[PDB]
Amino acid sequence: LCLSCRGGDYDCRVKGTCENGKCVCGS
């Protein structure tokens, strides 16, 4: 889950990992 970071679509921000201000919804 990404809150204090920028990322793609909401769905991507939910299942994404929040790292270094960036949301990563992948592997």
PDB file of N, CA, C and O in Angstrom:
ATOM      1  N   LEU A   1       0.846  -1.214   0.000  1.00  0.00           N
ATOM      2  CA  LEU A   1       0.000   0.000   0.000  1.00  0.00           C
ATOM      3  C   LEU A   1       0.871   1.249   0.000  1.00  0.00           C
ATOM      4  O   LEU A   1       1.811   1.367   0.786  1.00  0.00           O
ATOM      5  N   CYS A   2       0.555   2.173  -0.888  1.00  0.00           N
ATOM      6  CA  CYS A   2       1.302   3.403  -1.020  1.00  0.00           C
ATOM      7  C   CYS A   2       0.445   4.592  -0.614  1.00  0.00           C
ATOM      8  O   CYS A   2      -0.655   4.780  -1.136  1.00  0.00           O
ATOM      9  N   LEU A   3       0.942   5.377   0.330  1.00  0.00           N
ATOM     10  CA  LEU A   3       0.220   6.548   0.804  1.00  0.00           C
ATOM     11  C   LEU A   3       1.056   7.811   0.627  1.00  0.00           C
ATOM     12  O   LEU A   3       0.631   8.758  -0.034  1.00  0.00           O
ATOM     13  N   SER A   4       2.252   7.813   1.195  1.00  0.00           N
ATOM     14  CA  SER A   4       3.125   8.975   1.135  1.00  0.00           C
ATOM     15  C   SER A   4       4.137   8.837   0.000  1.00  0.00           C
ATOM     16  O   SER A   4       5.323   9.127   0.161  1.00  0.00           O
ATOM     17  N   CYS A   5       3.656   8.386  -1.145  1.00  0.00           N
ATOM     18  CA  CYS A   5       4.495   8.211  -2.314  1.00  0.00           C
ATOM     19  C   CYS A   5       3.665   8.279  -3.583  1.00  0.00           C
ATOM     20  O   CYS A   5       2.468   7.993  -3.572  1.00  0.00           O
ATOM     21  N   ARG A   6       4.307   8.659  -4.674  1.00  0.00           N
ATOM     22  CA  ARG A   6       3.624   8.821  -5.945  1.00  0.00           C
ATOM     23  C   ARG A   6       3.667   7.523  -6.729  1.00  0.00           C
ATOM     24  O   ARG A   6       4.638   6.767  -6.644  1.00  0.00           O
ATOM     25  N   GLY A   7       2.618   7.263  -7.485  1.00  0.00           N
ATOM     26  CA  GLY A   7       2.540   6.025  -8.222  1.00  0.00           C
ATOM     27  C   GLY A   7       1.514   6.070  -9.325  1.00  0.00           C
ATOM     28  O   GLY A   7       1.010   7.140  -9.670  1.00  0.00           O
ATOM     29  N   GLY A   8       1.211   4.908  -9.879  1.00  0.00           N
ATOM     30  CA  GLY A   8       0.264   4.822 -10.969  1.00  0.00           C
ATOM     31  C   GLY A   8      -1.178   4.872 -10.512  1.00  0.00           C
ATOM     32  O   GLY A   8      -1.548   5.690  -9.667  1.00  0.00           O
ATOM     33  N   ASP A   9      -1.988   3.985 -11.069  1.00  0.00           N
ATOM     34  CA  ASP A   9      -3.416   3.943 -10.778  1.00  0.00           C
ATOM     35  C   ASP A   9      -3.664   3.542  -9.329  1.00  0.00           C
ATOM     36  O   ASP A   9      -2.785   2.965  -8.691  1.00  0.00           O
ATOM     37  N   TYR A  10      -4.842   3.867  -8.808  1.00  0.00           N
ATOM     38  CA  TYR A  10      -5.209   3.519  -7.442  1.00  0.00           C
ATOM     39  C   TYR A  10      -4.902   2.056  -7.146  1.00  0.00           C
ATOM     40  O   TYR A  10      -4.247   1.741  -6.154  1.00  0.00           O
ATOM     41  N   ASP A  11      -5.355   1.175  -8.031  1.00  0.00           N
ATOM     42  CA  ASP A  11      -5.151  -0.262  -7.868  1.00  0.00           C
ATOM     43  C   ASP A  11      -3.669  -0.584  -7.703  1.00  0.00           C
ATOM     44  O   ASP A  11      -3.289  -1.463  -6.926  1.00  0.00           O
ATOM     45  N   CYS A  12      -2.837   0.163  -8.417  1.00  0.00           N
ATOM     46  CA  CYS A  12      -1.393  -0.003  -8.353  1.00  0.00           C
ATOM     47  C   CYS A  12      -0.855   0.494  -7.016  1.00  0.00           C
ATOM     48  O   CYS A  12       0.126  -0.028  -6.497  1.00  0.00           O
ATOM     49  N   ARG A  13      -1.523   1.489  -6.449  1.00  0.00           N
ATOM     50  CA  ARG A  13      -1.089   2.080  -5.192  1.00  0.00           C
ATOM     51  C   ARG A  13      -1.518   1.211  -4.018  1.00  0.00           C
ATOM     52  O   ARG A  13      -0.937   1.275  -2.940  1.00  0.00           O
ATOM     53  N   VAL A  14      -2.532   0.393  -4.235  1.00  0.00           N
ATOM     54  CA  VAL A  14      -3.042  -0.472  -3.189  1.00  0.00           C
ATOM     55  C   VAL A  14      -2.155  -1.697  -3.019  1.00  0.00           C
ATOM     56  O   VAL A  14      -1.739  -2.027  -1.908  1.00  0.00           O
ATOM     57  N   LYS A  15      -1.850  -2.349  -4.128  1.00  0.00           N
ATOM     58  CA  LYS A  15      -1.059  -3.572  -4.097  1.00  0.00           C
ATOM     59  C   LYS A  15       0.419  -3.283  -4.329  1.00  0.00           C
ATOM     60  O   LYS A  15       1.222  -4.199  -4.482  1.00  0.00           O
ATOM     61  N   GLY A  16       0.767  -2.009  -4.364  1.00  0.00           N
ATOM     62  CA  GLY A  16       2.139  -1.634  -4.601  1.00  0.00           C
ATOM     63  C   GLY A  16       2.905  -1.389  -3.323  1.00  0.00           C
ATOM     64  O   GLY A  16       2.317  -1.087  -2.282  1.00  0.00           O
ATOM     65  N   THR A  17       4.216  -1.529  -3.404  1.00  0.00           N
ATOM     66  CA  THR A  17       5.090  -1.259  -2.281  1.00  0.00           C
ATOM     67  C   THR A  17       5.598   0.171  -2.342  1.00  0.00           C
ATOM     68  O   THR A  17       6.063   0.632  -3.385  1.00  0.00           O
ATOM     69  N   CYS A  18       5.497   0.871  -1.233  1.00  0.00           N
ATOM     70  CA  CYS A  18       5.916   2.257  -1.173  1.00  0.00           C
ATOM     71  C   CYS A  18       7.398   2.348  -0.843  1.00  0.00           C
ATOM     72  O   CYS A  18       7.814   2.035   0.275  1.00  0.00           O
ATOM     73  N   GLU A  19       8.197   2.757  -1.819  1.00  0.00           N
ATOM     74  CA  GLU A  19       9.633   2.882  -1.626  1.00  0.00           C
ATOM     75  C   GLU A  19      10.168   4.170  -2.234  1.00  0.00           C
ATOM     76  O   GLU A  19       9.943   4.447  -3.412  1.00  0.00           O
ATOM     77  N   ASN A  20      10.875   4.942  -1.416  1.00  0.00           N
ATOM     78  CA  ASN A  20      11.594   6.135  -1.868  1.00  0.00           C
ATOM     79  C   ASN A  20      10.675   7.122  -2.579  1.00  0.00           C
ATOM     80  O   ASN A  20      11.043   7.702  -3.603  1.00  0.00           O
ATOM     81  N   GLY A  21       9.480   7.296  -2.040  1.00  0.00           N
ATOM     82  CA  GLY A  21       8.535   8.235  -2.613  1.00  0.00           C
ATOM     83  C   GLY A  21       7.874   7.710  -3.871  1.00  0.00           C
ATOM     84  O   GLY A  21       7.130   8.431  -4.536  1.00  0.00           O
ATOM     85  N   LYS A  22       8.116   6.445  -4.187  1.00  0.00           N
ATOM     86  CA  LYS A  22       7.562   5.839  -5.385  1.00  0.00           C
ATOM     87  C   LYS A  22       6.812   4.559  -5.057  1.00  0.00           C
ATOM     88  O   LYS A  22       7.273   3.736  -4.267  1.00  0.00           O
ATOM     89  N   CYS A  23       5.649   4.412  -5.656  1.00  0.00           N
ATOM     90  CA  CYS A  23       4.858   3.207  -5.503  1.00  0.00           C
ATOM     91  C   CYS A  23       5.263   2.184  -6.552  1.00  0.00           C
ATOM     92  O   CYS A  23       5.353   2.503  -7.739  1.00  0.00           O
ATOM     93  N   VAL A  24       5.523   0.966  -6.113  1.00  0.00           N
ATOM     94  CA  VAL A  24       5.952  -0.092  -7.011  1.00  0.00           C
ATOM     95  C   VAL A  24       4.973  -1.258  -6.974  1.00  0.00           C
ATOM     96  O   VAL A  24       4.976  -2.050  -6.036  1.00  0.00           O
ATOM     97  N   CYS A  25       4.137  -1.363  -7.991  1.00  0.00           N
ATOM     98  CA  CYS A  25       3.159  -2.439  -8.056  1.00  0.00           C
ATOM     99  C   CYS A  25       3.621  -3.529  -9.018  1.00  0.00           C
ATOM    100  O   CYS A  25       2.982  -3.800 -10.036  1.00  0.00           O
ATOM    101  N   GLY A  26       4.739  -4.153  -8.683  1.00  0.00           N
ATOM    102  CA  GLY A  26       5.300  -5.181  -9.533  1.00  0.00           C
ATOM    103  C   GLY A  26       6.187  -6.137  -8.763  1.00  0.00           C
ATOM    104  O   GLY A  26       5.979  -6.356  -7.567  1.00  0.00           O
ATOM    105  N   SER A  27       7.171  -6.710  -9.439  1.00  0.00           N
ATOM    106  CA  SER A  27       8.100  -7.638  -8.814  1.00  0.00           C
ATOM    107  C   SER A  27       9.435  -7.619  -9.555  1.00  0.00           C
ATOM    108  O   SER A  27      10.360  -6.909  -9.101  1.00  0.00           O
TER     109      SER A  27
END
